[PDB]
């Protein structure tokens, strides 16, 4: 019933930015917006996956 913050992860596999970061949001759609803005701010231009089982986004190339 309570809509908790949940931890979402971002695995970075860009040309110039690699590793992992995280955010908190109530849902995946919001986390995606946060992570895409972060990636774009850092010049990342890649392909994205989302894994619902692990709450993890990945951006590659």
Swiss-Prot record:
It is found in: Secreted, Cell wall. Sequence repeats lie at residues 7-61. Binds to the constant Fc region of IgG with high affinity. This is Immunoglobulin G-binding protein G. The gene is spg. The chain holds residues 227 to 282 of 448 of the full protein.
């Amino acid at each position: 019933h309570h809509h908790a913050m949940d931890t979402y992860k971002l695995i970075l596999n860009g040309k110039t930015l690699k590793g992992e970061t995280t955010t908190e949001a109530v849902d995946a759609a919001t986390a995606e917006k946060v992570f895409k803005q972060y990636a774009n701010d850092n010049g990342v231009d890649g392909e994205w996956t989302y894994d619902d089982a692990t709450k993890t986004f990945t951006v590659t190339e």
